[PDB]
Each structure stands twice: as structure tokens, then as C-alpha cells.
Amino acid sequence: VKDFDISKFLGFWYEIAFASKMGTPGLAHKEEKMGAMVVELKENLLALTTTYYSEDHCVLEKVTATEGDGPAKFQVTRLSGKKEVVVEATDYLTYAIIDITSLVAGAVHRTMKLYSRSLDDNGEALYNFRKITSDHGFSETDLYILKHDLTCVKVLQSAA
Amino acid sequence: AVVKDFDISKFLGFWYEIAFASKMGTPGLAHKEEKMGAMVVELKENLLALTTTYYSEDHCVLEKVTATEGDGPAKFQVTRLSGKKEVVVEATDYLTYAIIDITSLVAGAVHRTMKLYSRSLDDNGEALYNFRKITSDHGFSETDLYILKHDLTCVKVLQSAAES
Ligand SMILES: CC1=C(/C=C/C(C)=C/C=C/C(C)=C/C(=O)O)C(C)(C)CCC1
Numbered sequence: 492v493k494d495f496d497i498s499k500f501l502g503f504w505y506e507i508a509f510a511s512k513m514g515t516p517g518l519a520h521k522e523e524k525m526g527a528m529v530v531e532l533k534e535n536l537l538a539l540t541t542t543y544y545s546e547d548h549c550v551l552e553k554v555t556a557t558e559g560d561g562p563a564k565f566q567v568t569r570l571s572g573k574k575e576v577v578v579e580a581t582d583y584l585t586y587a588i589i590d591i592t593s594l595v596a597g598a599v600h601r602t603m604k605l606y607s608r609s610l611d612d613n614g615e616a617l618y619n620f621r622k623i624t625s626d627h628g629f630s631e632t633d634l635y636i637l638k639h640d641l642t643c644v645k646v647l648q649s650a651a
Numbered sequence: 652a653v654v655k656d657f658d659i660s661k662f663l664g665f666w667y668e669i670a671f672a673s674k675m676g677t678p679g680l681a682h683k684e685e686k687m688g689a690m691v692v693e694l695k696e697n698l699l700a701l702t703t704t705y706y707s708e709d710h711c712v713l714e715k716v717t718a719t720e721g722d723g724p725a726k727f728q729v730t731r732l733s734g735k736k737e738v739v740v741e742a743t744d745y746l747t748y749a750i751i752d753i754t755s756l757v758a759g760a761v762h763r764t765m766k767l768y769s770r771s772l773d774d775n776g777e778a779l780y781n782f783r784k785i786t787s788d789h790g791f792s793e794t795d796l797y798i799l800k801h802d803l804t805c806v807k808v809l810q811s812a813a814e815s
């Protein structure tokens with residue numbers, strides 16, 4: 492996305508689907524639980540709190556992202572384990588498809604996800620996710636549509 | 652029928668179950684573990700012999716069953732000791748997929764289930780898109796759709812029982 496403006500993406504986002512190779516497984520173992528994300532802007536850094544299911548438990552991760560050479564490219568430096576997240580597509584109103592490249596201590600991981608402001612009528616967004624991820628080298632076998640168990644969402648709604 | 656220039660000749664053989672809708676229931680789907688479902692369609696004479704596999708938690712079940720035509724082209728009737736089923740073909744491109752509507756009678760649940768069959772395991776994009784639109788205007792929420800997990804353990808048992 493060239494013309495990007497983060498004021499528009501602040502807040503609570505529901506993780507609808509992900510694609511991973513890768514697955515182982517993671518997420519879930521058984522049963523899958525849905526994930527979610529909170530985007531805040533904290534002192535010119537993007538402060539982020541995600542939740543997701545991981546072998547028997549709902550993980551909560553709080554992270555910081557610094558903007559990386561314009562537009563919709565962000566970078567998360569973990570203990571010298573980088574992640575690179577790019578906004579691939581967005582209609583600026585209901586959904587955003589994200590591309591994550593992470594280096595988890597040697598291991599490279601290439602993830603794509605579909606976030607949505609809503610748990611309902613995500614069909615157009617889902618169809619675009621399937622076109623874009625096949626374009627990025629993922630097959631149908633690599634896409635996971637999250638089951639609508641909300642336990643983790645609810646945990647994140649409450650606080651952190 | 653709902654599609655009206657249907658010929659079963661076009662639909663014989665192997666099909667994967669890609670998604671279903673049930674209300675819501677739871678868981679449903681399946682339970683745990685989702686295991687991919689599938690079907691073999693055989694034309695005996697005056698009868699459609701169908702053999703299905705699905706995960707009934709402890710194992711993959713192969714179930715063989717018969718269907719007869721029930722006036723109007725795309726409509727079939729299958730009777731089981733559990734109840735009768737009216738299945739109708741709602742949509743098809745005649746080449747890669749079919750969306751089926753099942754009105755069931757299993758001892759009292761006047762329920763419907765819609766299922767998406769496909770010829771293939773990839774490039775189901777447009778079929779899935781359609782399926783979401785049709786299930787939507789038939790009373791189903793996104794919550795009621797079940798996109799099947801690509802675990803193929805039952806499927807390979809179906810393929811192989813039919814293969815050899
Ligand atoms: C969801 C989302 C966004 C994501 C931002 C970041 C920073 C995502 C990081 C993801 C990681 C780091 C995932 C992982 O490791 O699984 C932005 C604000 C672009 C647009 C609105 C929706």
C-alpha cells in the first residue's frame with residue numbers, strides 16, 4: 492500500500508485466517524481458537540498486543556514495532572530476532588492482509604494473515620486472501636480459517 | 652430441480668467434500684480433529700451407489716448408500732433407517748465443483764445442510780466464494796460454515812477401497 496495512514500488501523504482486529512508453510516500444528520492440536528490484535532500508537536512506536544491459541548493455551552504477546560522505510564512496512568526487533576511485517580492489501584475500512592517474515596533464532600518463517608474489524612461477512616476479504624497467498628507461493632493446503640471459538644478474544648478484550 | 656440441464660454422466664467418480672453448512676449442533680464438523688471427507692458416485696442402473704468416508708471420532712467410516720431420482724433433474728432421494736433425505740443440486744459449473752442442498756429427516760430434525768463437493772484440493776477459491784454467497788442467502792451465518800481440514804486419512808482409505 493503506498494498511501495497508508497495508521498490512524499485508520501488503530502484498535503481491535505480479529506484474526507480470521509493465516510497461511511503458513513510450517514504447520515506443526517501451531518494454532519490447534521485439537522481445536523483452533525480465533526486470534527485477535529490490538530494496535531496502539533505509543534510514543535511514535537506501534538505498541539501491539541496479540542492473542543492466539545498455542546498447544547492447550549491462549550498466548551498473549553505484547554510487542555513494539557518501529558516504522559521501516561515508509562509506507563506500510565514495519566519491523567519488530569526481538570532479541571536479535573527480527574520480524575518484517577508489510578501490509579499487502581486493505582480496503583482501509585473492514586480488513587487488512589499482512590505479510591510477516593520472521594527470524595526466530597536462525598529459523599526463517601514466512602506467514603500471511605487476514606485481520607478484520609468484524610467476525611461476520613468476511614467472504615470478499617477471504618477470496619482476496621486466497622488470490623494473494625497463491626501469488627506468494629502458498630497453496631490451499633497452507634491456509635487455516637480460524638474456528639469461531641472466542642476464549643482468547645475475550646481474554647484480550649478484558650485487558651492485555 | 653435447481654440446476655435444470657443436469658446429467659449425472661458428468662458427475663461420476665471421485666469427489667472431495669471441501670466445506671459444509673449446518674446450524675448450531677456442535678462439533679458437527681468432526682468431533683476433535685477435522686479430517687477431509689469424500690465421496691465416490693457410481694451409476695448402477697436406476698440407482699446411484701454412493702460410498703462416503705467421514706471421521707466418526709474413533710475411526711474413518713466408509714458408508715455405502717443408494718440414491719434414486721425424485722422428479723426434476725438435479726433431485727435425488729436417499730432413504731436410510733435413520734430417516735429420508737432430499738438432496739438437490741443448487742449449483743455447478745459442470746466441470747470442477749457442485750453445491751448440494753440436503754433436507755434430512757433423521758428421526759425429527761427438520762434440518763438442512765449444504766455441502767460443497769470438488770473435484771480437486773487446490774484452486775477452490777471461486778467455488779468457496781459461491782458457497783459462501785448461496786449459504787448466506789439460505790439462512791446460514793459464517794459461523795455455520797465448516798471449511799474441512801486437509802487431513803486426508805479417511806480419504807485415502809476411500810480412494811484405496813475404490814481403487815483396489
Ligand atoms: C494486524 C494489523 C496490522 C499489524 C501490525 C503488526 C505490527 C503486525 C505484526 C504481526 C506479527 C509480529 C505476527 C507474528 O509474529 O505472528 C496493521 C497495523 C499493519 C494494520 C491493521 C491490522
Ligand SMILES: CC1=C(/C=C/C(C)=C/C=C/C(C)=C/C(=O)O)C(C)(C)CCC1
Pocket residue numbers: 662666690692699701718727729736738740749751753768
Ligand atoms: C456430491 C455430489 C453429488 C451428490 C449426490 C448425493 C446423493 C449426495 C448425498 C449426500 C448425503 C446423503 C449426505 C449426508 O447425509 O451427509 C452429485 C451426484 C449430485 C453431484 C456430484 C457431487
